[PDB]
């Protein structure tokens, strides 16, 4: 029980750490699309 709670908790920490990184990745990806869409708007503007 306390062992089961602890084990599950260690995994949760790892999953959150992993999602943290994925998020930063998507954020950076969105900054890239934004820049590219911008240049296009300016090109046809």
């Amino acid at each position: 029980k306390i062992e089961a709670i602890e084990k599950k908790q260690n995994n949760l920490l790892r999953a959150i750490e992993a999602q943290q990184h994925l998020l930063q990745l998507t954020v950076w990806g969105i900054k890239q699309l934004q820049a590219r869409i911008l240049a296009v708007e300016k090109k046809i503007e």
Side-chain angles (χ1 to χ4, degrees):
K1 186 175 209 62
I2 290 306
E3 291 78 9
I5 284 173
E6 184 163 2
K7 180 190 193 298
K8 193 177 289 184
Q9 182 176 74
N10 287 334
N11 286 335
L12 271 39
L13 198 207
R14 276 187 253 98
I16 294 172
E17 226 140 60
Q19 290 176 337
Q20 215 160 246
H21 297 142
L22 227 195
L23 266 171
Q24 286 304 318
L25 181 56
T26 63
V27 170
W28 174 89
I30 295 175
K31 290 189 182 306
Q32 290 306 108
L33 301 184
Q34 200 287 303
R36 289 208 282 149
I37 296 176
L38 187 58
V40 173
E41 290 161 329
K42 288 198 177 193
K43 195 87 183 75
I44 68 172
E45 177 193 273

